Scaffold this active site. Structure first.
Site, PDB file in Angstrom:
ATOM      1  N   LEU A  50      -7.667  -3.953   5.354  1.00 23.49           N
ATOM      2  CA  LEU A  50      -8.829  -3.075   5.682  1.00 23.49           C
ATOM      3  C   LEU A  50      -8.362  -1.391   5.859  1.00 23.49           C
ATOM      4  O   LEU A  50      -8.947  -0.728   5.570  1.00 23.49           O
ATOM      5  CB  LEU A  50      -9.948  -3.545   6.546  1.00 23.49           C
ATOM      6  N   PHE A 102       0.771  -1.194  -0.090  1.00 27.58           N
ATOM      7  CA  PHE A 102      -0.081  -0.199  -0.064  1.00 27.58           C
ATOM      8  C   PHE A 102       0.796   1.306   0.072  1.00 27.58           C
ATOM      9  O   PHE A 102       0.514   2.228  -0.684  1.00 27.58           O
ATOM     10  CB  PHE A 102      -1.017  -0.054   1.296  1.00 27.58           C
ATOM     11  N   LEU A 137      -2.303  14.108  19.986  1.00 22.61           N
ATOM     12  CA  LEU A 137      -3.059  13.359  21.233  1.00 22.61           C
ATOM     13  C   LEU A 137      -3.377  11.829  20.969  1.00 22.61           C
ATOM     14  O   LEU A 137      -3.214  11.179  19.861  1.00 22.61           O
ATOM     15  CB  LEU A 137      -4.370  14.158  20.998  1.00 22.61           C
TER      16      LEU A 137
HETATM   17  C1  LIG Z   1      -4.916  14.295   2.281  1.00 19.72           C
HETATM   18  C2  LIG Z   1      -5.624  13.870   3.319  1.00 19.72           C
HETATM   19  C3  LIG Z   1      -4.830  12.551   3.437  1.00 19.72           C
HETATM   20  C4  LIG Z   1      -5.420  11.504   4.433  1.00 19.72           C
HETATM   21  C5  LIG Z   1      -4.567  10.257   5.021  1.00 19.72           C
HETATM   22  C6  LIG Z   1      -3.212  10.386   5.502  1.00 19.72           C
HETATM   23  C7  LIG Z   1      -2.752   9.092   5.684  1.00 19.72           C
HETATM   24  C8  LIG Z   1      -2.881   8.567   7.286  1.00 19.72           C
HETATM   25  C9  LIG Z   1      -2.095   7.180   7.572  1.00 19.72           C
HETATM   26  C10 LIG Z   1      -2.890   6.738   8.737  1.00 19.72           C
HETATM   27  C11 LIG Z   1      -2.079   7.250  10.024  1.00 19.72           C
HETATM   28  C12 LIG Z   1      -2.856   6.639  11.359  1.00 19.72           C
HETATM   29  C13 LIG Z   1      -2.014   7.299  12.556  1.00 19.72           C
HETATM   30  C14 LIG Z   1      -2.594   6.418  13.598  1.00 19.72           C
HETATM   31  O1  LIG Z   1      -3.628   6.387  14.151  1.00 19.72           O
HETATM   32  S1  LIG Z   1      -1.334   5.531  14.463  1.00 19.72           S
HETATM   33  C15 LIG Z   1      -2.410   4.298  15.527  1.00 19.72           C
HETATM   34  C16 LIG Z   1      -2.805   3.273  14.724  1.00 19.72           C
HETATM   35  N1  LIG Z   1      -3.649   2.074  15.396  1.00 19.72           N
HETATM   36  C17 LIG Z   1      -3.537   1.176  16.118  1.00 19.72           C
HETATM   37  O2  LIG Z   1      -2.104   0.916  16.361  1.00 19.72           O
HETATM   38  C18 LIG Z   1      -4.617   0.429  17.055  1.00 19.72           C
HETATM   39  C19 LIG Z   1      -4.288  -1.052  16.910  1.00 19.72           C
HETATM   40  N2  LIG Z   1      -4.201  -1.580  15.551  1.00 19.72           N
HETATM   41  C20 LIG Z   1      -4.732  -1.764  14.590  1.00 19.72           C
HETATM   42  O3  LIG Z   1      -6.007  -1.354  14.676  1.00 19.72           O
HETATM   43  C21 LIG Z   1      -4.424  -2.144  13.194  1.00 19.72           C
HETATM   44  O4  LIG Z   1      -3.435  -3.100  13.396  1.00 19.72           O
HETATM   45  C22 LIG Z   1      -4.028  -0.998  12.035  1.00 19.72           C
HETATM   46  C23 LIG Z   1      -5.380  -0.425  11.715  1.00 19.72           C
HETATM   47  C24 LIG Z   1      -2.987  -0.077  12.800  1.00 19.72           C
HETATM   48  C25 LIG Z   1      -3.782  -1.602  10.695  1.00 19.72           C
HETATM   49  O5  LIG Z   1      -4.591  -2.877  10.342  1.00 19.72           O
HETATM   50  P1  LIG Z   1      -3.968  -4.241  10.186  1.00 19.72           P
HETATM   51  O6  LIG Z   1      -3.083  -4.747  11.252  1.00 19.72           O
HETATM   52  O7  LIG Z   1      -5.282  -5.045  10.153  1.00 19.72           O
HETATM   53  O8  LIG Z   1      -3.314  -4.164   8.605  1.00 19.72           O
HETATM   54  P2  LIG Z   1      -4.159  -4.100   6.950  1.00 19.72           P
HETATM   55  O9  LIG Z   1      -3.832  -5.615   6.687  1.00 19.72           O
HETATM   56  O10 LIG Z   1      -5.631  -3.470   7.414  1.00 19.72           O
HETATM   57  O11 LIG Z   1      -3.200  -3.307   6.591  1.00 19.72           O
HETATM   58  C26 LIG Z   1      -1.851  -3.361   6.601  1.00 19.72           C
HETATM   59  C27 LIG Z   1      -1.197  -1.941   5.910  1.00 19.72           C
HETATM   60  O12 LIG Z   1      -1.138  -1.069   6.757  1.00 19.72           O
HETATM   61  C28 LIG Z   1      -0.188  -0.478   7.062  1.00 19.72           C
HETATM   62  N3  LIG Z   1      -0.200   0.015   8.442  1.00 19.72           N
HETATM   63  C29 LIG Z   1      -0.007  -0.603   9.657  1.00 19.72           C
HETATM   64  N4  LIG Z   1      -0.055   0.194  10.869  1.00 19.72           N
HETATM   65  C30 LIG Z   1      -0.213   1.451  10.282  1.00 19.72           C
HETATM   66  C31 LIG Z   1      -0.395   2.586  10.757  1.00 19.72           C
HETATM   67  N5  LIG Z   1      -0.255   2.944  12.277  1.00 19.72           N
HETATM   68  N6  LIG Z   1      -0.660   3.767  10.112  1.00 19.72           N
HETATM   69  C32 LIG Z   1      -0.428   3.780   8.776  1.00 19.72           C
HETATM   70  N7  LIG Z   1      -0.461   2.540   8.071  1.00 19.72           N
HETATM   71  C33 LIG Z   1      -0.235   1.519   8.848  1.00 19.72           C
HETATM   72  C34 LIG Z   1       0.958  -1.453   6.880  1.00 19.72           C
HETATM   73  O13 LIG Z   1       2.181  -1.071   6.862  1.00 19.72           O
HETATM   74  C35 LIG Z   1       0.301  -2.077   5.730  1.00 19.72           C
HETATM   75  O14 LIG Z   1       0.757  -1.400   4.638  1.00 19.72           O
HETATM   76  P3  LIG Z   1       1.745  -1.935   3.538  1.00 19.72           P
HETATM   77  O15 LIG Z   1       3.186  -1.960   4.511  1.00 19.72           O
HETATM   78  O16 LIG Z   1       1.340  -3.338   3.382  1.00 19.72           O
HETATM   79  O17 LIG Z   1       2.265  -0.772   2.725  1.00 19.72           O
HETATM   80  N1  LIG Z   2      -1.187   9.034  16.169  1.00 23.31           N
HETATM   81  C1  LIG Z   2      -0.503   8.271  17.401  1.00 23.31           C
HETATM   82  C2  LIG Z   2      -0.400   9.389  18.366  1.00 23.31           C
HETATM   83  C3  LIG Z   2       0.777   9.205  19.128  1.00 23.31           C
HETATM   84  O1  LIG Z   2       1.771   8.309  18.807  1.00 23.31           O
HETATM   85  N2  LIG Z   2       0.795   9.105  20.666  1.00 23.31           N
HETATM   86  C4  LIG Z   2      -0.420   9.716  21.337  1.00 23.31           C
HETATM   87  C5  LIG Z   2       0.533   9.964  22.842  1.00 23.31           C
HETATM   88  C6  LIG Z   2      -0.531  10.088  23.792  1.00 23.31           C
HETATM   89  O2  LIG Z   2      -1.546  11.382  23.646  1.00 23.31           O
HETATM   90  C7  LIG Z   2       1.283   8.812  22.874  1.00 23.31           C
HETATM   91  C8  LIG Z   2       2.359   8.662  23.824  1.00 23.31           C
HETATM   92  C9  LIG Z   2       2.639   7.861  24.606  1.00 23.31           C
HETATM   93  C10 LIG Z   2       3.557   7.846  25.487  1.00 23.31           C
HETATM   94  C11 LIG Z   2       4.327   8.806  26.069  1.00 23.31           C
HETATM   95 CL1  LIG Z   2       5.493   8.624  27.140  1.00 23.31          CL
HETATM   96  C12 LIG Z   2       3.965  10.148  25.408  1.00 23.31           C
HETATM   97  C13 LIG Z   2       2.972  10.135  24.252  1.00 23.31           C
HETATM   98  C14 LIG Z   2       2.090   8.723  21.237  1.00 23.31           C
HETATM   99  C15 LIG Z   2      -1.427   7.115  17.789  1.00 23.31           C
HETATM  100  C16 LIG Z   2      -0.681   6.368  19.065  1.00 23.31           C
HETATM  101  C17 LIG Z   2      -1.198   6.600  20.269  1.00 23.31           C
HETATM  102  C18 LIG Z   2      -0.438   5.756  21.195  1.00 23.31           C
HETATM  103  C19 LIG Z   2       0.882   5.092  20.801  1.00 23.31           C
HETATM  104 CL2  LIG Z   2       1.843   4.734  22.292  1.00 23.31          CL
HETATM  105  C20 LIG Z   2       1.171   5.146  19.625  1.00 23.31           C
HETATM  106  C21 LIG Z   2       0.556   5.633  18.511  1.00 23.31           C
HETATM  107 MG   LIG Z   3      -7.450  -5.637   8.066  1.00 17.42          MG
END
Ligand SMILES: CCCCCCCCCCCCCC(=O)SCCNC(=O)CCNC(=O)[C@H](O)C(C)(C)COP(=O)(O)OP(=O)(O)OC[C@H]1O[C@@H](n2cnc3c(N)ncnc32)[C@H](O)[C@@H]1OP(=O)(O)O
Ligand SMILES: N[C@@H](CC(=O)N1C[C@@H](CO)[C@H](c2ccc(Cl)cc2)C1)Cc1ccc(Cl)cc1
Ligand SMILES: [Mg+2]
Length: 411
Positions: free
Chosen positions: A170, A4, A411
């Site tokens: 997804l 992706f 946040l």
């Molecule tokens: C101009 C406007 C633009 C708007 C959009 C801007 C971009 C925003 C981007 C989003 C910024 C979000 C910022 C936050 O909220 S960071 C917080 C992310 N959430 C979590 O960690 C919560 C627990 N984990 C999950 O819910 C799932 O494991 C997630 C949803 C993270 C992936 O679901 P799943 O594990 O079921 O996998 P898949 O098979 O569906 O998808 C696999 C693909 O996803 C890529 N992947 C995995 N983790 C992340 C991640 N943190 N950011 C970006 N991409 C990520 C991965 O490299 C692979 O792509 P590729 O390596 O194959 O290429």
């Molecule tokens: N978009 C991200 C925002 C972020 O990385 N944060 C949110 C912040 C809590 O508000 C967290 C964090 C965790 C630990 C410390 Cl010591 C400081 C900030 C990192 C989503 C996220 C949230 C938590 C974590 Cl650990 C990793 C990623």
């Molecule tokens: Mg998925």
């Protein structure tokens, strides 16, 4: 390697990043009329859903998904538990766009499966100071200055896929739909952070923690008693002593922020944040929204002596669920938010942050080494944590910068 991320408008390697010398778009200038009006296609058994994040019932549905399926550590000991009040605050700032809050539901049983959210931010994101100097040395100042004005862009956060739906691709679909809805409002860049490494950060900063309730932090195995405390007759007594704090603030004239402080706090914050390469621009309405006290969510104090506000700090609350413990259910963490110091040293201001947080029953104070947060780490007994947070842009080429040049709290 990335099926992706290789298709998206972002720098693909550190090598490519190293060649970037000016801020500007990765991709082709496009128009709203070029963007599909039809939602992105999705499996006939799922449907897109736009929650109303000001309606208690919809906020609770999203709160449960995150409670059970959002970020947790690798040992499955702690899982973030952002509150319903915190989600309304974070996702509905001034002029937010409801259509940027994007969910997937299973049609049959209406099961909530996934979420991602965007909020507006006005961001300084033009070429950074050290690359403007290099440009000047080459006669390229014009090109380096082209995107100096603050830009109205998207901050993306809260991406979450239900545990039963992991590794089914997804997340890319959610990302493509969010990008479509943002581009349909004539916004073409986003900023986002993650704890994981993706292609390709423009900055990365270590985590820091400051123990407030060490006995609880050791009981829940967030912390251990460090080895050097084993030379004492009572290692935990000596650990408690090391982290002990005053029971009341030390700065005269410290009090909670009120609405009438908004213009003074806006003035001293924006003068401070100006010094950093990447930072937000907040209006009076945004200062009100992000910094006025809100119970259980954000805590903000000013230093007012002789009728003038000269300093302020803020922290916000996020509890984490303690996944396995008979004595405790929750880890109550305080996170350093914005601040500005004009009359006292930063360490003296943030000591009062620690005092207030401890008095209010927080267990730990957390932060990232952005802003001037390194200037009080040792005296105030913060320790670095493991892993790195990482800052990213979507559709923005940007020279690598140090985290002490980032002023955007995420946040
Ligand atoms: C101009 C406007 C633009 C708007 C959009 C801007 C971009 C925003 C981007 C989003 C910024 C979000 C910022 C936050 O909220 S960071 C917080 C992310 N959430 C979590 O960690 C919560 C627990 N984990 C999950 O819910 C799932 O494991 C997630 C949803 C993270 C992936 O679901 P799943 O594990 O079921 O996998 P898949 O098979 O569906 O998808 C696999 C693909 O996803 C890529 N992947 C995995 N983790 C992340 C991640 N943190 N950011 C970006 N991409 C990520 C991965 O490299 C692979 O792509 P590729 O390596 O194959 O290429
Ligand atoms: N978009 C991200 C925002 C972020 O990385 N944060 C949110 C912040 C809590 O508000 C967290 C964090 C965790 C630990 C410390 Cl010591 C400081 C900030 C990192 C989503 C996220 C949230 C938590 C974590 Cl650990 C990793 C990623
Ligand atoms: Mg998925």
């Amino acid at each position: 390697a990335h099926a992706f991320w290789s298709t998206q408008p972002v720098p693909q390697t550190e090598d490519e990043t190293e060649k970037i010398v000016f801020a500007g778009p990765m991709d082709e200038p496009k128009t709203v009329a070029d963007i599909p009006e039809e939602p992105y296609p999705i499996a006939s058994t799922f449907e897109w859903w736009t929650p109303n994040m000001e309606a208690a019932d919809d906020i609770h549905a999203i709160y449960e998904l995150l409670r059970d399926n959002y970020v947790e550590d690798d040992d499955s000991m702690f899982r973030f538990n952002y509150s319903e009040e915190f989600l309304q605050w974070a996702l509905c700032p001034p002029n937010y766009i409801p259509d940027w809050h994007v969910a997937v539901r299973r049609k049959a049983d209406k099961k909530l499966l996934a979420f991602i959210a965007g909020v507006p931010v006005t961001l300084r994101m033009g070429t950074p100071k050290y690359m403007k100097v290099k440009a000047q040395e080459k006669g390229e100042g014009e090109e380096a200055a082209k995107y100096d004005e603050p830009r109205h862009i998207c901050e993306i956060n809260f991406l979450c896929v239900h545990k039963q739906l992991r590794e089914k691709r997804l997340a890319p679909i959610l990302i493509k739909e969010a990008t479509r809805r943002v581009n349909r409002t004539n916004v073409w860049q986003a900023v986002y952070t993650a704890g994981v490494l993706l292609p390709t950060p423009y900055a990365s900063g270590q985590y820091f923690h400051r123990s407030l309730n060490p006995e609880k932090l050791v009981e829940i195995r967030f912390s251990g008693i460090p080895a050097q405390y084993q030379k004492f007759q009572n290692p935990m007594a000596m650990l408690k002593r090391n982290y002990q704090l005053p029971s009341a603030p030390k700065n005269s004239g410290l009090r909670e922020m009120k609405p009438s402080d908004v213009p003074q706090v806006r003035r001293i914050l924006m003068n401070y944040l100006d010094s950093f390469d990447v930072g937000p621009v907040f209006s009076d309405a945004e200062i009100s929204h992000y910094l006025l006290p809100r119970d259980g969510v954000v805590f903000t104090y000013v230093v007012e002596n002789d009728k003038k506000v000269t300093d302020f700090f803020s922290f916000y609350r996020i509890p984490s669920t303690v996944i396995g413990n008979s004595n405790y259910n929750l880890l109550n963490a305080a996170y350093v938010h914005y601040y500005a110091a004009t009359s006292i040293p930063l360490h003296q201001l943030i000591l009062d942050l620690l005092i207030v947080a401890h008095s209010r029953g927080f267990d730990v104070c957390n932060m990232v080494e952005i802003l001037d947060n390194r200037s009080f780490v040792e005296q105030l007994k913060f320790g670095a944590g493991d892993g790195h947070l990482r800052y990213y842009f979507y559709n923005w080429a940007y020279p690598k910068i140090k985290p002490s040049q980032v002023a955007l709290v995420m946040l």
